[PDB]
């Protein structure tokens, strides 16, 4: 039933756990007032049964004391999170009954050894180090708190230049420092290729730089590159540097920057097929 919190003496811990699981640990949004009462009613049923298991004189202590110990431990673990006060007050009366009836093994082996007295900062987020530890609870029948002792104690020319000069720096300044190395890359390439008829060595050195200058341009803004690369191609073709055109500019895809090489572009952007479509060549892509 809805308003019944039955904990049988057959499997007390299991009956107790089912009530918590269904009435308290609900992963649906519930009024905290409801949840608090649900736990208070489960707690009260648990306390009743523990008291009976220990003192009723039915059954055998062998069996019933073990049942009480297990239920007490499970119940206390929940009380530390949901409601330590009722547990803290009741556990004092339980001890007092335990001692009066001279159940000293249960006092020593269970309540003391398993530290099942009042909840405190060792076991509950409802407490902290400035609260008074429940040391005194345990100081009965020759026992002390197990925690008592603890408390007493408590190309590469271009690269290197880019590595040196390229911190909160205004865009236009950093733009210019990038341009200075960009212009300096463009001007030596034009020398290497057009001071006369370029050697195989100097065609390699021009292609070397142009690939890395393109890569950097694709990040810093390839708009200058995209204009100028057309001028370079036209001069390559006027000077008849066919070897340079085919094996370097075409083969290594040194045309305009695009979505293949740069985050300035995406899918919908038109690829630069037309740039490569000279001297019989085609774009190295698709």
């Amino acid at each position: 039933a809805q308003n019944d919190y039955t904990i049988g003496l057959v499997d007390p811990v299991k009956d107790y756990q089912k009530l918590i699981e269904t009435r308290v640990q609900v992963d649906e949004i519930v009024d905290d007032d409801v949840t608090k009462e649900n736990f208070d009613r489960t707690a009260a049923a648990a306390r009743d049964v523990i008291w009976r298991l220990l003192f009723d004189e039915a059954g055998t202590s062998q069996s019933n004391t073990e049942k009480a110990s297990q239920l007490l431990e499970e119940y206390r673990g929940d009380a530390c999170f949901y409601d330590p006060t009722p547990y803290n007050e009741w556990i004092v009366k339980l001890r007092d009954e335990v001692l009066k009836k001279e159940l000293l093994d249960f006092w020593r082996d269970v309540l003391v050894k398993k530290q099942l007295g009042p909840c405190w900062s060792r076991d509950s987020d409802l407490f902290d180090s400035d609260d008074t530890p429940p040391l005194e609870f345990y100081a009965h029948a020759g026992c002390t708190a197990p925690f008592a002792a603890s408390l007493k104690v408590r190309l590469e020319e271009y690269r290197t230049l880019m590595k040196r000069f390229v911190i909160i720096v205004p865009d236009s300044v950093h733009q210019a420092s990038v341009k200075k190395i960009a212009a300096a890359a463009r001007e030596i390439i034009w020398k290497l290729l057009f001071d006369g008829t370029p050697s195989a060595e100097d065609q390699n050195k021009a292609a070397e730089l142009l690939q890395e200058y393109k890569g950097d341009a694709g990040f810093y803004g390839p708009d200058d590159y995209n204009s100028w690369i057309f001028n370079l191609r036209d001069e390559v073709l006027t000077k008849e540097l066919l070897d340079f055109w085919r094996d370097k500019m075409v083969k290594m895809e040194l045309g305009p920057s695009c979505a293949r090489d740069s985050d300035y572009y995406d899918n919908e952007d038109p690829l630069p097929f037309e740039f490569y479509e000279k001297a019989g060549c085609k774009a190295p892509f698709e």
Binding site: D171, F219, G221, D223, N226, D263, Y265, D266, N267, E268
Partner: protein
């Protein structure tokens, strides 16, 4: 027109604000900036056929990625953060959604509008496909409202516990989101409202993957983002959600 205008902000934000963290207005989009992560919490856009139409007067080639000086220096992403990071500077408010004027487009290139996105297979492909779809929605709906933003979603580990984990790049520790969303409302000719919402992972996605597979209930985006979208619309008054009729 050429600056943030009170009438336009109120037009863009017709259906409410997803959140109120560090909200900034540009000429044609609205941005909430996440100072901790150095990327937006969200951006908001109101698209029409006119505003997404190709305009000869808009040259995207004149636009460069630049630091946003209206953000305190401690919380600005910089080009240095993204350089050789393995990530693109990915627009939240896409440059193609803002073609009424050059400056409208220019303003999408502030690094405060950027988040690290996988390039090939996402920013440049699959994510663009979603962007292109939202623009094409203007041919169905006269007005298309869209909120775009990052997510940082948990995964399970060998210990059985759940964890959020993400790379942060550069000296400014720019966060790399695990996923991105778009939550979209179109207004039809009659007074009907239609919602779409997508969540796509920030990773290489196959080019043959249709964007439809990334459709998610809007409430699951809300729960993950810590935001409420289109709060002025009761969801019981939508006509469809991800192509599915509402009661």
């Amino acid at each position: 027109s050429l600056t943030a205008t009170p009438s336009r902000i109120g037009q863009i934000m017709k259906y409410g604000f997803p959140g109120l963290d560090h909200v900034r207005s540009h000429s044609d989009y609205v941005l909430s900036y996440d100072r901790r992560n150095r990327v937006p919490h969200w951006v908001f856009e109101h698209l029409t056929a006119e505003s997404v139409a190709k305009n000869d007067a808009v040259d995207r080639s004149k636009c460069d990625f630049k630091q946003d000086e209206s953000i305190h220096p401690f919380f600005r992403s910089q080009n240095t953060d993204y350089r050789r990071s393995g990530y693109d500077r990915g627009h939240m408010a896409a440059a193609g959604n803002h073609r009424l004027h050059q400056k409208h487009c220019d303003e999408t290139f502030y690094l405060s509008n950027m988040a690290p996105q996988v390039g090939q297979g996402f920013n440049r492909d699959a994510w663009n496909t979603l962007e292109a779809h939202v623009r094409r929605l203007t041919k169905t709906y006269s007005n298309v409202y869209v909120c775009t933003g990052p997510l940082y979603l948990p995964h399970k580990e060998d210990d059985g516990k759940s964890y959020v984990k993400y790379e942060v790049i550069g000296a400014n520790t720019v966060a790399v989101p695990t996923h991105f969303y778009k939550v979209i409302v179109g207004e039809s000719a009659d007074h009907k409202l239609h919602m779409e919402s997508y969540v796509m992972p920030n990773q290489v996605i196959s080019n043959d993957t249709p964007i439809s597979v990334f459709q998610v209930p809007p409430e699951s985006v809300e729960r993950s983002a810590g935001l409420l979208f289109f709060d002025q619309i009761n969801r019981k008054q939508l006509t469809t959600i991800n192509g599915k009729k509402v009661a």
